[PDB]
Amino acid sequence: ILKKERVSWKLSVKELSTLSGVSQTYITIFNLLIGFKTHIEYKESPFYEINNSYLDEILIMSNPNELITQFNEYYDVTIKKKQNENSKIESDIFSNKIKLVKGTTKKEVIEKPYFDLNWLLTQNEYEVFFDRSFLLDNNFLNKKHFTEKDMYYYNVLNDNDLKTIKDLIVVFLLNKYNYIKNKDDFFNIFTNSEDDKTKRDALYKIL
Amino acid sequence: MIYMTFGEILKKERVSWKLSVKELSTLSGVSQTYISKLENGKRNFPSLETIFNLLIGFKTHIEYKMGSESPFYEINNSYLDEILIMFINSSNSTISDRDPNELITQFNEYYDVTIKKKQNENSKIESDIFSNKIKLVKGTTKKEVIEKPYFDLNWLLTQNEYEVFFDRSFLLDNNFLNKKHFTEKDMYYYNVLNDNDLKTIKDLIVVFLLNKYNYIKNKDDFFNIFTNSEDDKTKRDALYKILYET
Amino acid sequence: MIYMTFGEILKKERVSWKLSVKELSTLSGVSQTYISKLENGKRNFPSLETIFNLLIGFKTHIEYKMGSESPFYEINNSYLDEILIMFINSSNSTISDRDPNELITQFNEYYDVTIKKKQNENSKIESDIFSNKIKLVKGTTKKEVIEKPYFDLNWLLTQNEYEVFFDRSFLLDNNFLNKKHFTEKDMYYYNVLNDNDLKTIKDLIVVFLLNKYNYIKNKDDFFNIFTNSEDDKTKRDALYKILYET
Amino acid sequence: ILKKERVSWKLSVKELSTLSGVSQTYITIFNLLIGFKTHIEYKESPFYEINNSYLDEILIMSNPNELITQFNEYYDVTIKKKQNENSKIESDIFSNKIKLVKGTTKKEVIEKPYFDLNWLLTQNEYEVFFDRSFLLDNNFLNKKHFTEKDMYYYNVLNDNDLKTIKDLIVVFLLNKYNYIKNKDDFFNIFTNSEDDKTKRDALYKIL
Amino acid sequence: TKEFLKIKLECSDMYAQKLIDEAQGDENKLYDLFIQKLAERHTRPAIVE
Amino acid sequence: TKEFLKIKLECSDMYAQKLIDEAQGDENKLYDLFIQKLAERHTRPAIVE
Amino acid sequence: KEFLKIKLDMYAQKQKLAE
Amino acid sequence: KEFLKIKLDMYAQKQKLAE
């Protein structure tokens, strides 16, 4: 159990099983620490300066530069080992055909990119529902005779609405962040083995 | 004169509405393979039930396009009746009794017993329907029960279980490019929407939807009323109460 | 029985629609002072023109509330006629000819010659109207020509001439509170919307409006047609072409 | 004329007349420099560090700490002199009953706060128009007989729309920036003579 | 009946009567008309903060 | 006439005919009906970037 | 005074609520 | 090479386009 920071960050036995190791058997050691590295990072100029140093303390944490240059080596092995397992499905990861669990780079690829908002709005294969709290019939009051589509699926968003929603969302996103014209180039310029400062000045130009 | 065969009329109407074979297959009880054949003439003029299945396919597509509202509900009927008359007075037609009004009345009978059955089967997965645990094919009533509600724009924006992606395009969620150091699989997934953004979006949607469309306080009472077999006039009277408080 | 005076009926109808005196004054040709008096009884039963002005006031307010659409256009008329009949059969009424159908027909005549005049005067400041260079009183047609279009939500969001404020509440446009030094009159005006924000807002509005309401390619042709005196049936036929391309 | 940076920032003879001095007579000297101090600032951690230093060069700029501590004194006089003229209309400036010209603290107070977006949407006195490009009638197709309101003012936004617009705008603003509950306290805590670092740690608490 | 039309639609009693008197007899016609205007008035109040 | 209904409303010719045949004679009734469905189809394409 | 460990062992052990 | 004076005498003389 050691210094139980699992609870001090609010985690569980089915959460750390997915993150790293555990395997539905809470009580190898090197591996489990990874399941809290990106967690501080998800949950900048002055931050990352003291984010590493926060988990560096725990490295020390019965039952220095000792582990600062020994465990930190194991990081660079297992991230490039899985990144070579990620290069074997890179098309799935660009198309977004993947179940990325919240603050969790544990994955499982799927036939259609279900969890892409911009896919769901901009696709003509399947009906898109909303809450059962909205009557989206529009000509409801002029329907003296109801079909099965009326009865069970009065909650379906129509094309005119699906397009209005998508255009609100991107009008919004365009205000806060910046657009990436070269979708594939930007993705491939970062998914490579090259150093953080290498592509730093390269990506900026694209923008 | 030269009069078209059943197959030639099926194709004429099918392509008029810009339907593919799969599209009409999925709309009707008829297989992709048998439709094509009936249009060629490799299989012989069909049973009155397949003519009825096919017309149901058309019905649950002209209603999707033109609308099932009061004026167009009738116009949709008179049209389906007209298409029905045509298949009956086809060049290669094998139907003995060529009475319009009977065959119309048969077709309406066949839809009523059909929808009663299609209601009764929907009532067996009632929960899965209402909870939106259904894959539903655009422009059709053809449903497939699924694990979750993946095709519910609200359920996606709601859950924090999985990370919700946006097209890799307006995908610069790292508004703070002050970071000179880049994280483990941070540049891999730089599209994901943060719980702030994902609920800034839900807000914008509902504010919009609240303006256009009626809100339903009794999600469950509304659904129970709508879905149950009951005189449409009794039904709509009952639904109007729920909505507008009457 | 005890039957109400004209003044007592004027008040009854005026308060039924939750109108103040100023509100009915502004809607009618009648002064704030003379209305009050007519309701008291300090001035005597009035001329048929003031009864007509007052009813115009009601007309251009029941239309604002109930709507001037096809069913309610008639119901609005039968109501105004009924109110007209009442003022005529008042206890202190001095009207000789107590013929319903004449007095109705007079009132309609009086509105037609009135609107012709109100059109002809609008045609003199035509440009000022169309360019939205008008102060317009909520729930009324009462217009005041102004320097600019200040009451055009689009014109405000458009111009970069003046800084556009938001209520001092969601007013933290300095998203970057990294600044340890504060500028000359920067904390005074920390509400102003930046040209990015002000046109992020225009976008959101038009995307919404485009979804609900018809867009007009020929802003000028539409306006010219609508505003000109012409048989309403000829007019609406002409307007429908412009909009929907017919 | 000297080093004509008027043109290098794209200004004019009717723009500098309003900003400072000029008086429709382009060719006292100390005063006009003010009409370019806030201009670099409108058009942060690393910026203000080198914004001042940019106009400090121009102080030097024929026909040191010489003017760094002499002209910079004239700044603190004329800004507290007008700030005592601004305290005489502070109610107008909080209510937003003021014509603040773009990147220009030249003012003129007005009877109703016309240039407040949130006022225009949330006021029941005057009709609010939009472009002449939108037919906002809704029951237009069911109007066989047209009124004057129909004909000349088919472009009026109705209450249901004015409220939807306001709620989109604030749902948006709530995402980017933070809300100030104490509207009057926040305004008065900054409109005072006290030093920039004084209220720096005081305002943060409010948030 | 009349008083429900008054409150819901926000008209007068005299106007509520004229509203009934036209499409009179037909309860369903009067009802449909009622419900039509009642759907126009939307939930414009949204969850503001 | 028929071919304009076809293209605009996006129906078939047979369906365009049945659309005319009901409310037939009354050009204005058929016209009103036409324009009604034509206003439903909104400018959903907006100025995206 | 543990005014950060409840507002946001490790992190406590050493613009977070400005978001 | 005057690649800032056109992208954004004084300022030229000495996250601006990241907005």
Instruction: For residue C145, give the DSSP letter.
Output: E
Stated as kind and residue range, the H or E segment containing C236 is helix C232-244
Which runs of consecutive H residues, i.e. helices, occur in F1-49?
Answer: 2-5, 13-21, 27-40
Q: In chain H, what are the helix, strand and coil shares in percent, each to the nearest 5?
A: 0, 0, 100
Give the three-state DSSP class for B151. Answer: coil
Task: Report chain F residues whose CB lies below 8 A from the CB of D137.
Answer: none
Q: Identify the CA nearest to D109 among candidates D125, D96, D126.
A: D96
d(CA D34, CA D20) in angstroms, rounded, equals 7
Buried/exposed code over B139-171 (b: 16+ C-beta within 10 A; e: otherwise): bbbebeeeeebbbbbbbbbeeeebbbbbbbebb
Amino acid at D113: P
| D171/B211 touch (CB, cutoff 8 Å), yes or no | no
Stated as kind and residue range, the H or E segment containing C214 is strand C214-215
Q: Identify the CA nearest to D49 among candidates D41, D38, D39.
A: D41
Q: Are A132 and B242 in contact (CB under 8 A)?
A: no
Q: Are strands C143-145 and C214-215 parallel, antiparallel or unpaired?
A: unpaired
Give the three-state DSSP class for D113. Answer: coil
D98, D100, D101, D104 alpha-carbon torsion, rounded to 10° = 140
Contacts of C139 (CB under 8 A, 6+ apart): C23, C61, C64
A117, A122, A124, A128 alpha-carbon torsion, rounded to 10° = 40
d(CA H16, CA H19) in angstroms, rounded, equals 6
B13 and B111 part of one domain = yes
Backbone angles phi and psi of A138, in degrees to 5: 75, -50
D116 and D196 part of one domain = yes
Searching chain A, which residue's CA lies closest to the CA of residue E36? A141
B114, B116, B121, B124 alpha-carbon torsion, rounded to 10° = 180
Residue where a domain terminates, one of C89, C122, C155: C122
- Please report the number of interchain residue pairs, chain B to chain C, with beta-carbon separation below 8 angstroms: 7
C23 and C68 part of one domain = yes
How many C-alpha atoms does C57 have within 13 Å on its Cβ side?
A: 27
Number of domains in chain F: 1
User: Based on the number of CB atoms within 10 Å of its own CB, is D39 exposed (0-12), middle (13-18) or buried (19 or more)?
Assistant: middle
Q: Let me know if residue A92 belongs to a domain.
A: no
A63 and A126 part of one domain = no
Q: Are strands B134-136 and B143-145 parallel, antiparallel or unpaired?
A: antiparallel
Q: Pick from F35, F38, F42: which is nearest to C211 by CB?
A: F42
- Rg of chain A (C-alpha set): 23
Cα-based distances in Å from A191 to A84, A86, B183: 10, 9, 12
C50 and C109 part of one domain = yes
Q: Which two tokens stand for residue A191?
A: 């998914």
Q: Are B157 and B176 in contact (CB under 8 A)?
A: no
Q: Are strands A134-135 and B214-215 parallel, antiparallel or unpaired?
A: antiparallel
Q: Are D16 and D6 in contact (CB under 8 A)?
A: yes
B31 and B108 part of one domain = yes
Stated as kind and residue range, the H or E segment containing D162 is helix D159-176
Q: Are D101 and D18 in contact (CB under 8 A)?
A: yes
Instruction: For residue B236, give the DSSP letter.
Output: H
| F38/C207 touch (CB, cutoff 8 Å), yes or no | no
Q: Let me know if residue C128 belongs to a domain.
A: no
Amino acid at A126: Y
Q: Which two tokens stand for residue A194?
A: 């090259």
Q: Are C164 and C153 in contact (CB under 8 A)?
A: no
Alpha-carbon torsion (F15, F16, F21, F26), positive or negative: positive
Q: Identify the CA nearest to F33 among candidates E36, D138, C217, A142.
A: A142
Count how many residues are written for chain G.
Answer: 19
d(CA A2, CA B29) in angstroms, rounded, equals 64
Give the three-state DSSP class for A79. Answer: helix
Number of domains in chain B: 2
The minimum CA-CA distance between A178 and chain G, rounded to whole Å, is: 19
B and E touch per CB criterion (3+ pairs under 8 A): yes
Q: Which two tokens stand for residue D126?
A: 């005057």
Helices vs strands, H then E, count in chain A: 12, 1
Q: Let me know if residue B102 belongs to a domain.
A: yes
d(CA D150, CA C122) in angstroms, rounded, equals 14
Amino acid at B187: M
Q: Let me know if residue B58 belongs to a domain.
A: yes
Q: Is D175 an 8 Å CB contact of chain A?
A: yes
User: Based on the number of CB atoms within 10 Å of its own CB, is B206 exposed (0-12), middle (13-18) or buried (19 or more)?
Assistant: buried
- Please report the number of interchain residue pairs, chain C to chain E, with beta-carbon separation below 8 angstroms: 35
Contacts of B241 (CB under 8 A, 6+ apart): none
D72 and D36 part of one domain = yes
Q: Which two tokens stand for residue B130?
A: 């209402």
C and F touch per CB criterion (3+ pairs under 8 A): yes
- Rg of chain C (C-alpha set): 24
d(CA D179, CA C91) in angstroms, rounded, equals 61
The minimum CA-CA distance between A42 and chain B, rounded to whole Å, is: 9
Q: Is B234 an 8 Å CB contact of chain E?
A: no
B51 and B112 part of one domain = yes
How many C-alpha atoms does B124 have within 13 Å on its Cβ side?
A: 7
Residues 203-232 of C with CB under 8 A from B: 204, 208, 211-212
Q: Identify the CA nearest to A101 among candidates B189, H18, E13, D24.
A: B189
Beta bridge partners of D109: D98
Would you tell me the crossing angle of helices C32-40 and C6-16 to the nearest 10 degrees? 120
d(CA D77, CA D84) in angstroms, rounded, equals 11
Task: Report chain C residues whose CB lies below 8 A from the CB of F39.
Answer: 214, 243-244
Q: Identify the CA nearest to C214 among candidates D131, F23, D37, A147.
A: D131
Residue where a domain terminates, one of B122, B137, B172: B122
Task: Report chain B residues whose CB lies below 8 A from the CB of D168.
Answer: 204, 207-208
Q: Is B243 an 8 Å CB contact of chain E?
A: yes
Stated as kind and residue range, the H or E segment containing C144 is strand C143-145
Amino acid at F29: K
Which runs of consecutive H residues, i.e. helices, occur in A23-124?
Answer: 29-32, 37-42, 48-60, 71-86, 90-95, 117-121
User: Residue written as tokens 């529009």?
Assistant: A138
d(CA D143, CA D136) in angstroms, rounded, equals 13
Q: Which contacts qualify for D71-75: CB closer than 8 Å, 24 or more apart?
A: D71/D30, D71/D33, D74/D30, D75/C184, D75/D34, D75/D37
Amino acid at D136: L
The CA-CA-CA angle for residues G4, G6, G7, to 5°, reads 60
Beta bridge partners of B136: B143
Chain breaks in chain E (C to N over 2.5 A) after: none
- Rg of chain D (C-alpha set): 23
Contacts of B3 (CB under 8 A, 6+ apart): B90, B91
Stated as kind and residue range, the H or E segment containing C240 is helix C232-244
Cα-based distances in Å from D169 to B206, D118, D174, E10: 14, 9, 9, 30
- Rg of chain E (C-alpha set): 13
Contacts of E18 (CB under 8 A, 6+ apart): C75, C78, C79, C82
The CA-CA-CA angle for residues C205, C208, C213, to 5°, reads 110
> Strands, DSSP E only, in B80-229?
134-136, 143-145, 214-215
Q: Which two tokens stand for residue B8?
A: 């030639």
Instruction: For residue C135, give the DSSP letter.
Output: E
d(CA C210, CA D2) in angstroms, rounded, equals 52
| H11/D58 touch (CB, cutoff 8 Å), yes or no | no
Q: Identify the CA nearest to C226 among candidates D137, F37, F38, D160.
A: D137
Q: Let me know if residue B238 belongs to a domain.
A: yes
Q: Let me know if residue A153 belongs to a domain.
A: yes
d(CA A143, CA B72) in angstroms, rounded, equals 10
Q: Which two tokens stand for residue D5?
A: 């940076």
Q: Are C128 and C149 in contact (CB under 8 A)?
A: no
User: Residue written as tokens 């004239």?
Assistant: D74
Beta bridge partners of A135: B214
User: Based on the number of CB atoms within 10 Å of its own CB, is B216 exposed (0-12), middle (13-18) or buried (19 or more)?
Assistant: buried
Structural determination approach? X-ray
The CA-CA-CA angle for residues F9, A138, B211, to 5°, reads 125
Task: Provide the domain limits for residue F43.
Answer: 1-49
Helices vs strands, H then E, count in chain B: 11, 3
- Please report the number of interchain residue pairs, chain D to chain F, with beta-carbon separation below 8 angstroms: 4
Amino acid at B86: M
- Chains touching B by CB (3 or more pairs below 8 Å): A, C, D, E, F
Task: Report chain A residues whose CB lies below 8 A from the CB of G5.
Answer: 8
Residue B222, number of CB atoms within 10 A of its CB = 21
Task: Provide the domain limits for residue C183.
Answer: 147-244
Q: Pick from B73, B184, B216: which is nearest to A145 by CB?
A: B73
Longest CA span, chain B: 83
Q: Let me know if residue C183 belongs to a domain.
A: yes
Q: Is A168 an 8 Å CB contact of chain B?
A: yes
Q: Is A172 an 8 Å CB contact of chain D?
A: yes
Residue A57, number of CB atoms within 10 A of its CB = 13
Cα-based distances in Å from D188 to A188, D105, D194, D200, D203: 52, 18, 11, 14, 11
Backbone angles phi and psi of C194, in degrees to 5: -75, 150
Q: Is A50 an 8 Å CB contact of chain G?
A: yes
Stated as kind and residue range, the H or E segment containing D60 is helix D48-60
Contacts of A77 (CB under 8 A, 6+ apart): none
D46, D48, D51, D52 alpha-carbon torsion, rounded to 10° = -130
Contacts of B89 (CB under 8 A, 6+ apart): B98
Contacts of A134 (CB under 8 A, 6+ apart): A155, B209, B213, B214, B215, B216
